[PDB]
Amino acid sequence: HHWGYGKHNGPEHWHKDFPIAKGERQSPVDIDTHTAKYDPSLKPLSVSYDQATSLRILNNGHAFNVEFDDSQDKAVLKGGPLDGTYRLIQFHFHWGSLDGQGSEHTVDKKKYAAELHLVHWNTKYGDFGKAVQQPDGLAVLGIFLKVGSAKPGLQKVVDVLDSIKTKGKSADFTNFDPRGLLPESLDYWTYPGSLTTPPLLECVTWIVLKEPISVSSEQVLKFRKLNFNGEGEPEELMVDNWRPAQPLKNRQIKASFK
Ligand SMILES: Cc1cn([C@H]2C[C@H](n3cc(COc4ccc(S(N)(=O)=O)cc4)nn3)[C@@H](CO)O2)c(=O)[nH]c1=O
Ligand SMILES: [Zn+2]
């Protein structure tokens, strides 16, 4: 009886195995745009992905992860609210059964069709497993997806999903350039939070871009053909793999922009 996104194991149950689910800095949150404060001391984000080395794509039963070589500074996030250098380890998405839901963060209560998470760990902690034990261990760059025009840079991801339909399947996924998933603007909101899946560790500096990317209806429809189940198990479509907004508690969301 493992955590998931079903009626019997979804977000409202997670606190029983992961009591930090009710903690002081949980994610995601609603971003109230009128209450977020412009912080003129925030720096431009530095996204340095030119030397990124993607390796593999994995269906882990919760989402699919595009994994990177993080054994050198090849794809790094710096600047913005961050002190030091954060290395890209993987990206994944959360998405809905319907275009009207799927994001984890919301903006003035608006839900997007999906949300991209580019996950980075602080190199001062040596590896990802040590980093998640620290309050400044991770930086997750979140990008909203809306349905409209296709995102050309997403199509290579979409087209490999048939090969990783079920939980535990992986495929080679080299030479994928994550720069093709970014919007034009790097304006962002930032706040201290958590992983949005178990173990829900309070180790993340969230950086959520204001500008969504557009993906086509056909691209998100292919996300919704994935399965939560393993091969040889009853088919359950991988949809609505998002945690809803959590209480903001004693936090301020800062804006990089007026
Ligand atoms: C590719 C790779 C993996 N691993 C280890 C660490 C991996 N892992 C991931 C997690 C949970 O992390 C999360 C949860 C939520 C978010 S969210 N939604 O953005 O908030 C973000 C990150 N916990 N452990 C584990 C399974 O992949 O295998 C490795 O050691 N080396 C590698 O090269
Ligand atoms: Zn995520």
Curated annotation (Swiss-Prot):
It is found in: Cytoplasm; Cell membrane. Activated by X-ray, histamine, L-adrenaline, L- and D-phenylalanine, L- and D-histidine, L-His-OMe and beta-Ala-His (carnosine). Changing Y5H: Reduced proton transfer rate. The active site is at H62 (proton donor/acceptor). Pfam families: Carb_anhydrase. Optimum pH is 6-8. It catalyses: hydrogencarbonate + H(+) = CO2 + H2O; urea = cyanamide + H2O. Catalyzes the reversible hydration of carbon dioxide. Can also hydrate cyanamide to urea. Stimulates the chloride-bicarbonate exchange activity of SLC26A6. Essential for bone resorption and osteoclast differentiation. Involved in the regulation of fluid secretion into the anterior chamber of the eye. Contributes to intracellular pH regulation in the duodenal upper villous epithelium during proton-coupled peptide absorption. Belongs to the alpha-carbonic anhydrase family. This is Carbonic anhydrase 2. The lineage of its organism: Eukaryota, Metazoa, Chordata, Craniata, Vertebrata.
